[PDB]
Swiss-Prot record, chains A, B, C, D:
Family: Belongs to the FAH family.
Positions that bind substrate: 81, 173, 247
Biological process annotations from GO: D-arabinose catabolic process; protein homotetramerization
Subunit text: Homotetramer.
Functional summary from the UniProt entry: Participates in a pentose oxidation pathway that converts D-arabinonate to 2-oxoglutarate.
Keywords attached to this entry: Calcium, Carbohydrate metabolism, Lyase, Magnesium, Metal-binding
Keyword Lipoprotein: no
Organism phylogeny: Archaea, Thermoproteota, Thermoprotei, Sulfolobales, Sulfolobaceae
Descriptive protein name: 2-dehydro-3-deoxy-D-arabinonate dehydratase
E.C. no: 4.2.1.141
Residue numbers binding Mg(2+): 134, 136, 155
Amino acid sequence: MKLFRVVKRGYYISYAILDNSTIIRLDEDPIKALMRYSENKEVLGDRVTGIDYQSLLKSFQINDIRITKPIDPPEVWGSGISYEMVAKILGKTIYEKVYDAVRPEIFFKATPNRCVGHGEAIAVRSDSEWTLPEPELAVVLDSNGKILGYTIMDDVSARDLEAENPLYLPQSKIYAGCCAFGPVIVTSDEIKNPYSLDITLKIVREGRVFFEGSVNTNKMRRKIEEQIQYLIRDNPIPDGTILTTGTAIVPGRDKGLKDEDIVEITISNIGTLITPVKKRRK
Amino acid sequence: MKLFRVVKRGYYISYAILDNSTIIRLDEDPIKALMRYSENKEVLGDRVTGIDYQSLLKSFQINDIRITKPIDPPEVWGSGISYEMVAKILGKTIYEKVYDAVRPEIFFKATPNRCVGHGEAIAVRSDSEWTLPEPELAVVLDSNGKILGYTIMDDVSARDLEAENPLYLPQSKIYAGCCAFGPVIVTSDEIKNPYSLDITLKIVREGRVFFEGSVNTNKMRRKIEEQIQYLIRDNPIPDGTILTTGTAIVPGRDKGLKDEDIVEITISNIGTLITPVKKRRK
Amino acid sequence: MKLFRVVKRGYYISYAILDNSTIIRLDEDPIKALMRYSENKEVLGDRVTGIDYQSLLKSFQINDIRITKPIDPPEVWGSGISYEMVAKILGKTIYEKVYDAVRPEIFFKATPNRCVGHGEAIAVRSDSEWTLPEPELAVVLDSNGKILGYTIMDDVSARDLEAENPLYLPQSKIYAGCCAFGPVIVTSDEIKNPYSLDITLKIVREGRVFFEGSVNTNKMRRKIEEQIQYLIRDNPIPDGTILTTGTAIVPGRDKGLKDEDIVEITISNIGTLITPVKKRRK
Amino acid sequence: MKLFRVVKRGYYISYAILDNSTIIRLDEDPIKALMRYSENKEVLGDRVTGIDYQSLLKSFQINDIRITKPIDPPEVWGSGISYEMVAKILGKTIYEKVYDAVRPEIFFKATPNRCVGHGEAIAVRSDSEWTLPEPELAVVLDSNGKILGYTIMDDVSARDLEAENPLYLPQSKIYAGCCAFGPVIVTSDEIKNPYSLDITLKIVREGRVFFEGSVNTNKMRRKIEEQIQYLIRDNPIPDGTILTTGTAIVPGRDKGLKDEDIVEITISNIGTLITPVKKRRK
């Protein structure tokens, strides 16, 4: 099952694609719907025609329906340095110490209103000279830490403020439009092996491929279930929480984002998340 | 006005004390009520007798009413190193670089369900050997960053995990019972000078004053309005957000919290916030 | 307990008077509150001062509080010809046949929005030349038919349309402002004997006692519990239904109501319900 | 447009048939949806397949969907003696006086919870020996009295209690299961001439046509818009009110309903409303 959501005259409607490319309109709340599928694979709703999923992906809007965030995630948490490869602890950089330590990095990324979806604008902080997208695999979680599905997430990071001091990390990570995900949430059975997926980042400036990069999830050192385990320890998370698993694609110092740019992120079996860039006014 | 809230048979009731020690039961939501007072000092409700504010402070519960968090803060943000006085940037420690830099530290502290109030238990992470309370002045904010009132907050911090690596800071700061505040929210006109208040920390173990410390807010280097300014920049905050302003009282390596302890925090004009300690099971 | 309700800035607040003239503000819905008292006589709320019940009765409004209907009755049912003393069945008038028959009269009187309260205007139909108030004792009922309390009701009746044909009875009885009740609902234990109460009707025109009449409930032939029994038979009634028990005070053909009139109805132990009259425009 | 509604796992879903036999699932509340069509004929929703309208009509339930009342009518009002052809006024029977008078009969029939729909059981009062169905054309109304659509209604009447005394009419007309309507609500443009429709009543006992009768609406003396006019005069009605227009098909004294019977009512362009009969236990 692949689940997406549209906004129509100020209200939401959630749809799901079954393997045979038939579209079902959901009776239930999308998060609630994912928990059900996670148990017995039952889907409650009616089969619809006239919903052009393929056009929605390309054109975002058709008539009076517009695609958006597939769900409203109550909490979004991140996890950095999970692939194989200035502030320093006794000679070693903080990043490489965490790479080797038992305890992974876990941080609070976003609230639902700080997130955007397919075809909506991510933002660059008014006071950042160097902001990069971080293309990551992300998981949707229930309150016990059970994986309800997968999606593409863009962990938008004001890399310059982070470099200045690791104590500025929250300011670098949490802001309006700091996070984008979609275009769907694929159920768990739609991905046989999560550690064998291709993630591709493209930044597009005035029709020009300004950056192109790729990495496969088989290069992920720190496994997903360990990230989950450390996230939920003594820490209650609501149903529909998203944990974003980290990035391997890191553009250079010169590849910093700016106004009008287009960030396209592709992951096998999920699709391509396209977000325009809007630079904040001081 | 001094505003508190009780839980009675599974529902909340909000009350407010006017200077002449008369208690008013509120018609409005407490956050909504604070926004009103912030404009024209109007309070909507009826005068009540039989509500023993003074007993509630000492005994927490009377008959079927129990005092709790005065409001449900949609977001709680912290701000460290704001008073005058290992990871390091070119010789200098990360903490002292932020002490001198233009940009203050701002971090996401808690969601409302991760907070507790007067007479409820703060927690120590199951995997922390050294956790300290951080006694701080805290402000209640509207969406524009206007100060709606003041309160006492305990920024409960797993100091050992933080010391190990600054990237563990979120794990050290965000968990169930990681934050406590109360016992009231005092309106802005109840504090003529916020930079002239006495904050006192006491940890009590088996009847014993295990730690006692004090500092006055006139020692606050980084001012409050600057913390607000940096918090809201490109970052939308909901009505009733609490920003906690930082601590000067830091117990030693040997004064780490444990099960059954009592943390009492006193600030002039606000009162005394008392929270028992509960140590988490692995 | 004597329970009343005010409207304050577009919202309701319910209060209750305990025998010792102390006023309690209710935590619960008034209908829900009556069901509780009906079981164990428990009242949930806080004691208030500054609510001037006695002024409210006389002046209707004080500052920003105005007295109104004590509850929103989901259904209002009437019962005619219950005291001892043209359409006709085999010589006898329909009214006198029902007087003698086993089966009492039961009719649907009003929906909640067709009702008004103490100090609000009852109406006369635009097409009625002869409308009279019918001063009656009324009972508040739970879904099983248990008496939750008593009140005063004015069954406002377009007597001329009724006289023309008994099939016009619904049109004579159901309209905007066709019904008024209050000023309180007295709990069941506040009336030792319901069949020993004085009901008094006064119509007041330009300061003038235009009509004065009285009757005692000891003259009630058809008992209340029989009316209840016939009302609920095969007929589900919601909690807080009001059944009005019938009238003995009937003004003459010349005493028909008109614009600006004042209808005052008094019953022992309950009080005096005052409603101005407004004549409808064609 | 022809609009119906199902109950599925404790919740409602509303569908509409467009002339070309395509089924649309509604985004809006059905009453709200009818008001929209009444203005500009716009319908908000998605085209569905797999909803077998024709099976629903015949079998009531398929899988986990069951057809029911097409809407929840806030108020149901009746109107008797509207076709061309003991209590008496000066020699003439009350019924024939109303037949000739300017003022039609209007009565309150039911609340929504006293109504049932296609395939659900109408009831006979436990104390009625002679109850008949009254097959009528019914209109759905907005608050101004504008006709939003048409439906079939069964005005179930305890004819014996009515005959005994016209003051028992409410008891004869208002009870649990006293009213049934459906199976759809047809929009106004689906009926070119409301005064040219065939209404057919069949009572079925153990496979046997126990009664069969028919009449055409061209025999309706008292017109519909006059009934509306008299209904709303000084009397506010909510959106989605149903007014039932009266019957011409009256079975004999021997054709009284009983347990297990099947009442089938057919009207041109609307369909056939089928309701089993359940006799009440004393």
